[PDB]
């Protein structure tokens, strides 16, 4: 039951993607099974890009191999992050219903689906528009979603600028179908020194919210989200959710000061830390 | 140091290639940079196998995205196994002498490049036949090798049945340019394997054999953990005692794989290495085979 599909990108060099992802959920005991989306030379903040992506036959091909040798019923959970097309995102959808369908005929747990809505950062979207609505839909079918401020703000319409406006975010999420949403971090004009995240968990019809803090870091950090959401899976197997989250937000707090020491994570270098970090974020009810 | 550029397959089923290889080469400390000469549902050994293959193209834009942000000089060691492409065989020995010209020009020590010429296995080439003597080609330009029996037999055209024939297949790839090779198994003796390791300065040969017990059954992805388990252990041991540890490693995989429910009889699935079972015995395996010199 710790057999993950993990439809993230691919990059020779560096920590993104299923390489932020990998390891992590594989040293938690999880067989992660990749599919690819690009499979490109580095990220998209090196000056030089190169290398393949997937279109939609592409993966409706590999999907065709997996349903063919029996594996869909395996995928205890899906776990989406970078695919910027707007068919394949389409195309999860179909991927989740056939192995919920595969599982079910099984008598298996149901799959837990993590979609991590990965369009942008730092107020830029790396993705054209028909990918946003293509996410919203998606949306309509996860059981976790993690974006970050910015694809929440774009998702749901709403600035998340403080706890008020992630929680309208968060109940976009929930009207959309999704039950369970993190949104990973923000920044507080009133409280400069740390970043807030906010998990909110709808039945009933009722919303129960946590949220906590970590310190504000100086500098900018890619594969954050990818190590956050592998972590996250990983915790919340085991773990009610809002302790799965201050576990990830721990890993998370590690792996940066660790790099302050000692822009790209080593993800590899503290194996412990990613299993059983120093300290866990306060996850605290919200009245 | 410790930064490996890994050209193999990538499956999204089961434990080949580059899945099977960088787990235990990160365990072990390593920066595995992958470039995925295939990216399939799963291994060849299933009744349908579906998905993507490089072509020299794609392979020679990966290449161009690692020399413009000057990553080739990080490559201290190179490692090859899945390829089945003719023309990215080739372009391979190309790839090496680039990364050993860009560490030269950064003051770093030479790479180690380990071919392991993978083509096929129990007596069954699953490689096209262009691809055989692209790998005799490459071979000059090795540093260490790790065919299986089928594959030293197939380059060599000697067919490895015993020791004495697996030293004549290690004499020929010596003689090709390959200082260091391992043939990983061959044949009283029924329950146990026999491997050689075979060391080319000088014009002297070193030669060792050690055993290894036999588990009925057919398994995938060993000589990928083997040779991924041979460039993290010969980064910091001689070369004899590198092989013990990996054949160590290999038989505490094979025998946590068996105890899972992976018998000789059971499906591929069940089959599949269990890499992921015993992180520890990836870096600190229960036994280390002794690897013993011939006279
Ligand atoms: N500058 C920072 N300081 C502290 N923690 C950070 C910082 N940037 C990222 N994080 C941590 O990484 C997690 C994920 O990063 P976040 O930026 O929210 O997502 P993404 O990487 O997808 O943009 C956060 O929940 C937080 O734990
Ligand atoms: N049936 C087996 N019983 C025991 N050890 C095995 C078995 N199959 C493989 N191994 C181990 O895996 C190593 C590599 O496997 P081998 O079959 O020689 O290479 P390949 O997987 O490339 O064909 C061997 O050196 C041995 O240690
Ligand atoms: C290919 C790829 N995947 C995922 C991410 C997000 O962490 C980025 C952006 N660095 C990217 O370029
Ligand atoms: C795709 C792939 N990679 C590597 C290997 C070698 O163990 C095989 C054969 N199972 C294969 O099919
Ligand atoms: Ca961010
Ligand atoms: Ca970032
Ligand atoms: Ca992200
Ligand atoms: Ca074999
Ligand atoms: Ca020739
Ligand atoms: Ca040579
Ligand atoms: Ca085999
Ligand atoms: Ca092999
Ligand atoms: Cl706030």
């Not at 970050?148 to 600035?159: G, H, K, Q, R, W």
């Not at 109940?171 to 009133?190: E, R, Y």
Request: with cysteine; aromatic share 8%.
């Amino acid at each position: 039951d710790k057999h993950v599909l993990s439809i993230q990108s691919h990059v020779t060099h560096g920590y993104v993607g299923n390489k932020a992802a990998t390891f992590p959920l594989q040293l938690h005991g999880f067989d992660v099974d990749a599919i690819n989306t690009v499979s490109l030379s580095n990220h998209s903040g090196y000056p030089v890009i190169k290398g393949h992506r997937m279109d939609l036959e592409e993966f409706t091909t590999i999907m065709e191999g997996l349903r063919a040798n029996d594996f869909l019923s395996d995928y205890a959970y899906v776990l989406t992050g970078y695919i910027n097309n707007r068919d394949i995102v389409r195309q999860v959808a179909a991927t989740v219903a056939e192995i919920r369908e595969a599982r079910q005929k099984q008598g298996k747990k149901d799959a837990v689906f993590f979609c991590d809505p990965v369009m942008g950062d730092d107020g830029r979207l790396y993705c054209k528009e028909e990918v946003v609505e293509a996410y919203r839909e998606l949306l309509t079918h996860a059981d976790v979603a993690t974006p970050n401020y910015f694809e929440a703000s774009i998702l749901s319409t709403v600035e998340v600028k403080d706890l008020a406006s992630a929680i309208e975010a968060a109940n976009w999420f929930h009207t959309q179908g999704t039950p369970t949403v993190v949104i990973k971090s923000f920044a507080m004009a009133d409280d400069p020194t740390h970043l807030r995240f906010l998990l909110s968990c709808r039945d009933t019809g009722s919303t129960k919210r946590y949220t906590g803090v970590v310190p504000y870091h100086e500098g900018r950090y890619t594969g954050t989200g990818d190590v956050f959401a592998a972590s996250l899976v990983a915790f919340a197997h085991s773990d009610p959710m809002d302790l799965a989250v201050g576990k990830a937000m721990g890993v998370l707090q590690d792996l940066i000061k660790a790099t302050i020491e000692r822009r790209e994570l080593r993800v590899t270098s503290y194996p412990d830390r990613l299993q059983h970090p120093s300290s866990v974020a306060l996850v605290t009810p919200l009245p």
